[PDB]
C-alpha cells in the first residue's frame, strides 16, 4: 500500500506518482498564464490575485527577471518558484561568465529541464511543483517561448498557456492562429501585443480585469521588463475601445 507513491520510482504501470503530484501542485495558485510572440517582442501574462488587504500587493508576483534579456513566469507555489528563479538567475550569470554571451531562452529551458529531470531519478529529492515559462527576444532566434514542467520535459512555443484553465486559453489561441494563419501577433508595437494577449484571456476565461488583477512581463530586443499597474491601466483603457 504505497512506497512507489512517495519516492521517485516506477509503479508497475511505469509511472512516477511523485511527478504527477508535482503537476497538481502547479495549479495550487489557482492562477492562469499565457505567452505570445510579437513581430519582434514576447509577452507573458499571469493573473494576480491578492485576496488579503494586509499583503503589500507590490510584493506578490509570480513573474521574474532572470537575465537582462530572459524573463520567466511560474505556475505553482511561490517557494518552489523562488527556488527555481534564483537557480535560473545564477545559471544565466554563470553561463555568461564562462561563454562570453547571454544565455538564450531555449538553453536555459533545457538546463532547467535537465535539473527537474534529476529530481525525477533521485529518490531523496522531490521535483519542484512548478511550470516555468521562459521568454525572450533571442539574438539568433527572435522572440522565444520555452516552458519546462516537473517531468523534465521542455519545448518551444508559438504561444502557450498554463494553469487551471490551460486548456480553455490554449484552444482560444490555436483558433486565432488558424485564422491569422501565422505563428505570431503581426503587430509592430508591443503595447498592442499586450492588448491582444489581455483581450484573448478575458475572452477565454469569461472574466474581466482591473489593473490589479494582472501582471504583464514583456521581452524586447535587449531587455525584459514588467509593467506597473499604470502601464496596464493604459492597456486596459485602450482594449476598452476595441470591440
Amino acid at each position: 500500500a504505497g512506497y512507489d507513491r512517495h519516492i521517485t520510482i516506477f509503479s508497475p504501470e511505469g509511472r512516477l506518482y511523485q511527478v504527477e503530484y508535482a503537476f497538481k501542485a502547479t495549479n495550487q495558485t489557482n492562477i492562469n498564464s499565457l505567452a505570445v510572440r510579437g513581430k519582434d517582442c514576447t509577452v507573458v501574462i499571469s493573473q494576480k490575485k491578492v485576496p488579503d488587504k494586509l499583503l503589500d500587493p507590490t510584493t506578490v508576483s509570480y513573474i521574474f527577471c532572470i537575465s537582462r534579456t530572459i524573463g520567466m513566469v511560474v505556475n505553482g507555489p511561490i517557494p518552489d518558484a523562488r527556488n527555481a528563479a534564483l537557480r535560473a538567475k545564477a545559471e544565466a550569470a554563470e553561463f555568461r561568465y564562462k561563454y562570453g554571451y547571454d544565455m538564450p531562452c531555449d538553453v536555459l529551458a533545457k538546463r532547467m529541464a535537465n535539473l527537474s529531470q534529476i529530481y525525477t531519478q533521485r529518490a531523496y529529492m522531490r521535483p519542484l511543483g512548478v511550470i516555468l515559462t521562459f521568454v525572450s527576444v533571442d539574438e539568433e532566434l527572435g522572440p522565444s517561448i520555452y516552458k519546462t514542467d516537473p517531468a523534465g520535459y521542455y519545448v518551444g512555443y508559438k504561444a502557450t498557456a498554463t494553469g487551471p484553465k490551460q486548456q480553455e486559453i490554449t484552444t482560444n489561441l490555436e483558433n486565432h492562429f488558424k485564422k491569422s494563419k501565422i505563428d505570431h501577433i503581426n503587430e509592430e508595437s508591443w503595447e498592442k501585443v499586450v492588448e491582444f494577449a489581455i483581450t484573448h484571456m478575458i475572452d477565454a476565461l469569461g472574466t474581466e480585469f482591473s489593473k490589479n488583477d494582472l501582471e504583464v512581463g514583456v521581452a524586447t530586443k535587449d531587455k525584459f521588463f514588467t509593467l506597473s499597474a499604470e502601464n496596464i491601466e493604459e492597456r486596459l483603457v485602450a482594449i476598452a475601445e476595441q470591440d
Binding site: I9, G14, R15, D106, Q121, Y124, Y157, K158
Partner: protein
C-alpha cells in the same frame, strides 16, 4: 545530503528486477521508433508527436547526433533520453576522442551508453532510465551498424527493429520487407511505410523525424583544406525531403 545509498532496484524471489520490467513497461507506451540497416547506410526514425499545435515539433530532437557518423533515437521517457544524449556525447569525447584523436566506433560508444544505463540499475538512490534506444552509426573498421539499448543496460545489434507501441506489429512488417540487398533509399522507403501504421493523426514531414547514417557530406563539414576529413555520415532529413519522398510511395 543523499541518504539513499542503497539500490532501489533489487532481485525478487522469481528472479525479476522489478524496476527494470517497469522501465520497459514505460517504453511500450512511448511513441514507436525504428531502425533499418542497408548496404550503404542506416535509417532511424520516429514520429514527432506534439500534443498542442502551438508547440514547435521542429524544436525537438527525438533524433540526435552523438558523433558525426553516429545518431540515436528512443521510445519512452524523453527527458531521460535527452540527458543520455548529453552524457553519451561527453563520454564519446572524454573517454575516447580525447585519447585516440578519433571518435569512438558505434559498438563501443553503445557500450558506454549502456554502461551508464546499467549503473542506474544498481547504484543507490535511483530508478533506471525509462527509455530504450536505437543507435545507428558507421565506423571505419565495422561498416554500418545498428544497436538497441534497454533500461537493463543490455544491448544488441539488429539488421532492423522497432520499439514502443508498434514494436510487436512493426517488427512483423520489417521481417517481411528486409533483405541483404537493400540499398539505403529502399530502406528509407520501408521505414516510412512501417511508421505509417503506428502514426494515427497527421502523417507528414512535420509529424515525422527521420535521420540517416550514409555517405560523407563535404558540403556539411564547414571547412575545406584537409582532404582526409570528409564530413559527417549523419544527415537528418528536412521535412521538405520527407514529403517529397512520401509523394512517391
Amino acid at each position: 545530503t543523499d541518504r539513499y545509498s542503497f539500490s532501489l532496484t533489487t532481485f525478487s524471489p522469481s528472479g525479476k528486477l522489478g524496476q527494470i520490467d517497469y522501465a520497459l513497461t514505460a517504453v511500450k507506451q512511448g511513441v514507436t521508433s525504428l531502425g533499418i540497416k542497408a548496404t550503404n547506410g542506416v535509417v532511424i526514425a520516429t514520429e514527432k508527436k506534439s500534443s498542442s499545435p502551438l508547440a514547435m515539433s521542429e524544436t525537438l530532437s527525438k533524433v540526435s547526433l552523438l558523433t558525426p557518423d553516429i545518431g540515436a533515437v528512443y521510445s519512452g521517457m524523453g527527458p531521460d533520453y535527452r540527458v543520455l544524449v548529453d552524457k553519451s556525447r561527453k563520454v564519446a569525447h572524454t573517454s575516447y576522442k580525447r585519447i585516440y584523436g578519433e571518435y569512438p566506433p558505434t559498438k563501443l560508444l553503445v557500450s558506454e551508453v549502456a554502461k551508464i544505463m546499467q549503473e542506474a540499475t544498481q547504484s543507490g538512490g535511483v530508478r533506471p532510465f525509462g527509455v530504450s534506444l536505437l543507435i545507428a552509426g558507421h565506423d571505419e573498421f565495422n561498416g554500418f551498424s545498428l544497436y538497441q539499448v534497454d533500461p537493463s543496460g543490455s544491448y544488441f545489434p539488429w539488421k532492423a527493429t522497432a520499439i514502443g507501441k508498434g514494436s510487436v506489429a512493426a517488427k512483423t512488417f520489417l521481417e517481411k520487407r528486409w533483405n541483404d540487398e537493400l540499398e539505403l533509399e529502399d530502406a528509407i522507403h520501408i521505414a516510412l511505410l512501417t511508421l505509417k501504421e503506428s502514426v494515427e493523426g497527421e502523417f507528414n514531414g512535420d509529424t515525422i523525424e527521420l535521420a540517416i547514417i550514409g555517405d560523407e557530406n563535404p558540403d556539411l563539414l564547414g571547412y575545406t583544406g584537409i582532404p582526409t576529413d570528409k564530413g559527417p555520415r549523419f544527415r537528418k532529413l528536412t521535412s521538405q525531403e520527407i514529403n517529397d519522398r512520401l509523394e512517391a510511395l
